[PDB]
Motif scaffolding. Structure first.
Motif, PDB file in Angstrom:
ATOM      1  N   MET I   1      73.875  34.184 -16.760  1.00 48.94           N
ATOM      2  CA  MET I   1      74.042  32.873 -16.822  1.00 48.94           C
ATOM      3  C   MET I   1      73.123  32.335 -18.194  1.00 48.94           C
ATOM      4  N   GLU I   2      73.358  31.145 -18.867  1.00 51.97           N
ATOM      5  CA  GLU I   2      72.815  30.597 -20.205  1.00 51.97           C
ATOM      6  C   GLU I   2      71.991  29.369 -19.963  1.00 51.97           C
ATOM      7  N   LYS I   3      70.914  29.124 -19.852  1.00 57.00           N
ATOM      8  CA  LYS I   3      70.173  27.996 -19.553  1.00 57.00           C
ATOM      9  C   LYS I   3      69.430  27.476 -20.689  1.00 57.00           C
ATOM     10  N   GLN I   4      69.594  26.179 -20.744  1.00 55.05           N
ATOM     11  CA  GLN I   4      68.829  25.237 -21.575  1.00 55.05           C
ATOM     12  C   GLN I   4      68.449  23.967 -20.934  1.00 55.05           C
ATOM     13  N   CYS I   5      67.487  23.165 -21.559  1.00 52.23           N
ATOM     14  CA  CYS I   5      67.104  22.037 -20.971  1.00 52.23           C
ATOM     15  C   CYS I   5      67.423  20.794 -21.918  1.00 52.23           C
ATOM     16  N   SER I   6      67.754  19.404 -21.366  1.00 43.85           N
ATOM     17  CA  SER I   6      68.001  18.346 -22.013  1.00 43.85           C
ATOM     18  C   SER I   6      67.189  17.270 -21.488  1.00 43.85           C
ATOM     19  N   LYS I   7      67.000  16.190 -22.238  1.00 44.95           N
ATOM     20  CA  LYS I   7      66.283  15.202 -22.118  1.00 44.95           C
ATOM     21  C   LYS I   7      67.302  13.955 -22.290  1.00 44.95           C
ATOM     22  N   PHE I   8      67.260  12.960 -21.126  1.00 43.34           N
ATOM     23  CA  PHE I   8      68.099  11.701 -21.354  1.00 43.34           C
ATOM     24  C   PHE I   8      66.954  10.290 -21.051  1.00 43.34           C
ATOM     25  N   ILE I   9      67.311   9.593 -21.749  1.00 43.52           N
ATOM     26  CA  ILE I   9      66.684   8.415 -21.590  1.00 43.52           C
ATOM     27  C   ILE I   9      67.701   7.014 -21.226  1.00 43.52           C
ATOM     28  N   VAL I  10      67.470   6.612 -19.794  1.00 44.76           N
ATOM     29  CA  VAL I  10      68.083   5.710 -19.271  1.00 44.76           C
ATOM     30  C   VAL I  10      67.686   4.281 -19.050  1.00 44.76           C
ATOM     31  N   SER I  11      68.455   3.428 -19.757  1.00 44.87           N
ATOM     32  CA  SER I  11      67.852   1.994 -19.841  1.00 44.87           C
ATOM     33  C   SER I  11      68.537   0.849 -19.102  1.00 44.87           C
ATOM     34  N   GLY I  12      67.978  -0.174 -18.704  1.00 39.78           N
ATOM     35  CA  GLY I  12      68.658  -1.143 -17.747  1.00 39.78           C
ATOM     36  C   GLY I  12      67.740  -1.251 -16.546  1.00 39.78           C
ATOM     37  N   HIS I  13      68.625  -2.023 -15.577  1.00 40.35           N
ATOM     38  CA  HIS I  13      67.866  -2.158 -14.337  1.00 40.35           C
ATOM     39  C   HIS I  13      67.934  -0.733 -13.609  1.00 40.35           C
ATOM     40  N   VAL I  14      66.935   0.025 -13.727  1.00 42.64           N
ATOM     41  CA  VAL I  14      67.067   1.485 -13.371  1.00 42.64           C
ATOM     42  C   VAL I  14      65.786   2.004 -12.632  1.00 42.64           C
ATOM     43  N   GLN I  15      64.762   0.814 -12.304  1.00 43.30           N
ATOM     44  CA  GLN I  15      63.726   1.462 -11.554  1.00 43.30           C
ATOM     45  C   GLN I  15      63.698   0.601 -10.307  1.00 43.30           C
ATOM     46  N   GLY I  16      62.986   1.289  -9.142  1.00 42.43           N
ATOM     47  CA  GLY I  16      62.907   0.675  -7.764  1.00 42.43           C
ATOM     48  C   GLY I  16      64.048   0.539  -7.200  1.00 42.43           C
ATOM     49  N   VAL I  17      65.400   0.917  -7.685  1.00 42.75           N
ATOM     50  CA  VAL I  17      66.622   0.673  -6.766  1.00 42.75           C
ATOM     51  C   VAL I  17      67.368   2.066  -6.603  1.00 42.75           C
ATOM     52  N   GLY I  18      66.372   3.191  -6.498  1.00 44.68           N
ATOM     53  CA  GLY I  18      66.869   4.431  -6.009  1.00 44.68           C
ATOM     54  C   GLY I  18      67.582   5.457  -6.905  1.00 44.68           C
ATOM     55  N   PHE I  19      67.472   5.090  -8.355  1.00 48.45           N
ATOM     56  CA  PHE I  19      68.061   5.757  -9.355  1.00 48.45           C
ATOM     57  C   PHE I  19      67.591   7.203  -9.409  1.00 48.45           C
ATOM     58  N   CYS I  20      66.028   7.197  -9.423  1.00 56.10           N
ATOM     59  CA  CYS I  20      65.681   8.468  -9.493  1.00 56.10           C
ATOM     60  C   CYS I  20      65.687   9.454  -8.591  1.00 56.10           C
ATOM     61  N   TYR I  21      65.881   8.947  -7.213  1.00 56.28           N
ATOM     62  CA  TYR I  21      66.241   9.878  -6.060  1.00 56.28           C
ATOM     63  C   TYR I  21      67.703  10.457  -6.270  1.00 56.28           C
ATOM     64  N   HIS I  22      68.588   9.251  -6.601  1.00 58.05           N
ATOM     65  CA  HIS I  22      70.116   9.565  -6.603  1.00 58.05           C
ATOM     66  C   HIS I  22      70.336  10.787  -7.872  1.00 58.05           C
ATOM     67  N   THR I  23      69.446  10.439  -8.762  1.00 62.20           N
ATOM     68  CA  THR I  23      69.719  11.478 -10.027  1.00 62.20           C
ATOM     69  C   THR I  23      69.267  12.596  -9.784  1.00 62.20           C
ATOM     70  N   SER I  24      67.958  12.984  -9.022  1.00 59.01           N
ATOM     71  CA  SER I  24      67.427  13.909  -8.436  1.00 59.01           C
ATOM     72  C   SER I  24      68.614  14.745  -7.434  1.00 59.01           C
ATOM     73  N   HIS I  25      69.159  13.938  -6.532  1.00 60.97           N
ATOM     74  CA  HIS I  25      70.141  14.618  -5.677  1.00 60.97           C
ATOM     75  C   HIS I  25      71.123  15.086  -6.511  1.00 60.97           C
ATOM     76  N   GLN I  26      71.635  14.528  -7.309  1.00 60.46           N
ATOM     77  CA  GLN I  26      72.902  14.685  -8.118  1.00 60.46           C
ATOM     78  C   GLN I  26      72.673  16.096  -8.973  1.00 60.46           C
ATOM     79  N   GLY I  27      71.460  16.194  -9.491  1.00 62.48           N
ATOM     80  CA  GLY I  27      71.085  17.149 -10.217  1.00 62.48           C
ATOM     81  C   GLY I  27      71.067  18.734  -9.367  1.00 62.48           C
TER      82      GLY I  27
END
Lengths: 91, 91, 91, 91, 91, 91, 91, 91, 91, 91, 91, 91
Positions: I1-27
């Motif tokens: 396998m070949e592993k690297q890391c990426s950083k993403f900045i998400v803007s908008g109404h993205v806090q307190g609306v389950g985004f972090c949990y869902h993103t975590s689950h998706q990842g």
């Protein structure tokens, strides 16, 4: 104090009937450490470590001792385990 | 492997006398899961899940089984609980 | 060293304003054990166990002790539970 | 953001079929907090706290959302809960 | 309910033979709290808290109760402990 | 900063009355670390580590600070502890 | 309930003097969530979430409230974060 | 209320691609228990316990269900497992 | 396998609306590791580590994947991370 | 395998200088179990259980093994300890 | 016993190669506390707290101490940290 | 960063002599993950994951590296393991 590990293979109606918990409980009362592991074929693999006398006590309990499970056979296997297990865990 | 849940209402001198722990221990030796919950009125609510035979075994132990608590009555209540309870916790 | 439990119902604006935390903190400073439980009608059920004198101290604090919440009323209800809780947790 | 709590009583074949786990998962995806509780009569009590818009979305999911459980009815009850629950537990 | 604590000093072959675990389990079945501690001289120090009757019941078990350990003497010592211990720990 | 550890022996009605909890809470607000141990004779052994100014402040609280316990006497005994404790635990 | 988050930069002698613990404790009594982070330049970053009225109350405590730390300045910064933090952690 | 355990061997590009996590999540939504185990030859061993209809559902998902992993084949092997696992863990 | 890391900045109404949990689950379903951190300006910082194809997969979900949040922009920022994170935490 | 416990009293500049962590680390590499307790007088009490040869190795390391601490003396005390200590903990 | 904190910025091939673990291990052997934090640009931020002698000892190890990572530079940065960090964490 | 997994079967006097602890510690200093597992025949199974360069480094250490255990042979076995293990466990 002397210490050795022994492996027991237990067969019969031994899963889902509190056998692993009761064996773990019984072993801890004897100052024994190891694990009770549920095998895919419906057997339970019991590993116990301590003095040969206490192991003999446990072996006798696996056979005769009052329990919920219906033990049909307890086969004593040769073991070269010298690892320190913490507590008596259910696997 | 059939699994059902039964609810028991135990009344008497049954709180703070090791009854919840002992009930938990006995249920786990039977391969049962559920809980022993302390009610405000002094009663202890026991919910146990497993095969009917093991549930009859617990119901009998609640009545006659050697214990510290002074059990006066054990009432069996209807239950439609089909939830997989983890272990046998004290509540 | 006589120990008993008491149930308190606190009404008013007492949820989400740090009342349950502060109550448990106050109870632990009194050497008490039990819980603070949020009810669906906005009330908070406080169960505490210890010597009667300490339970009297807690009741007095619930009514007029310096806090964030607005307490309109504190009512002590009957309790026959003699279970020993661990610490003072929020429910 | 404004924040309120709602109570739901879900009836039908809803226990032991991954409903509480799925509800909590769906709740957390909506940024909600609360719990899913197994009742003795076979029902499941669902409490959720968040924005009215997200609670509505959860209400609709409980009714129509693809799930293993077969929901008979979802009753929405009034709630004065203003307590902040951590995550979405199953009880 | 009344609460007092008692200290016990058990001597003989009582270490590494499940005595601390068994004692702990025995006390919990009596509704007792405290600890079982291994001392450097080979003895085991047992502290138990609860009602006088239960403590007497444990004191009797330490002497003649069925156990793996071989108990020489169970010395009962005075104690002014009024602290609430969680469960029955092994030290 | 220059830390040191001081040992305190507190006597009176200081066990089971929230003293160990309150002491640790007060010590943590002072930025201190250490523990509060319950002794067999009814005393409480308090060990705290930090700057001397904080330790004096804690000593005065152990004496005069508003608390549930009834303090007879506080004695600072010698200590050569240089170990870094985490938080402020109860023993 | 309306929920807002506020950011505070506290400067002075505020590290290693129980400030983060005391702030956390004070925030929880106000029904607030968030964190207190120790910054490399010696400052302490305090993020708190709750009703605006409670935030103002914490803002006042950071300035005047009796504590061990010597607060030099408390700058309130703008914050757009609407995340639900669990408890009030020290970082 | 009829429970059994089934064992599945999944081959292909199924390790390190979120398959074990996704399987457990899917199984938990079905109200199943068991584990997803990584084998040395690249295969994934999946054990699940529940009603046959649910195990059917899981098997079909393992084959066709939207997932990151590239499944080449799924084989249900024999199992006489009657142990009750808690949750759905990765090994 | 070949592993690297990426950083993403998400803007908008993205806090307190389950985004972090869902993103975590998706990842985690993508076999990715990293975190979702809530930023003070309302943004969410998503760092994920794995194979590039999965990272492309995550970025696409961040943009248009069915979610509660309203994403107006997803930007991928540079990263030289080579650290192995455990799971997908929310910060 | 034969097993025994030995107590070591270590004096010198031995507290707060990584000695407890290093002794613990060293003991675990030797397959030993026990603890390293910081004493009030500035000493460190080391208890280690295992084969006599492994104990002699640890004893030698305590005296002259490379470490941050300034060990002045290592006294070997007689011990009737036969308890199973888990890991090598710091006290 | 004085105590200060120092920040080190370590650059090079220092991530995902056991540097954070080894640094943590080494610092704990020196009696230090703090953390090793993986930065987004590939650097590792190391904060350590203790006596200047021990901090100089760690600073030297970061440069010359036998390790897996290829350390190219170690920048000693100013710090006003006076927070008591628990253990040596990997961030 | 490339990562693969290798399996090692170490024989000799390798159980109960700190080999598993030392191996896991050594792997973590190399930035490797996996486990060290005690087998019934007396052998220890070592699975390590990371860059091929580091795996060879561990392989060499298993053979020649200073350790308590007496290693007879280190047999390297093929592995298609691509699962991400957390840390380096002992089994």
């Amino acid at each position: 104090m002397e210490k050795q590990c022994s492996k027991f293979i237990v067969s019969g109606h031994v899963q889902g009937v509190g056998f692993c918990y009761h064996t773990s409980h019984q072993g801890l009362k004897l100052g024994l450490t190891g694990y009770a592991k549920n095998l895919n074929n419906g057997d339970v693999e019991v590993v116990a470590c301590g003095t040969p006398e206490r192991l003999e006590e446990l072996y006798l309990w696996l056979q005769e001792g009052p329990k919920t499970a219906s033990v049909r056979q307890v086969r004593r296997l040769s073991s070269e385990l010298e690892h320190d297990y913490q507590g008596f865990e259910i696997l």
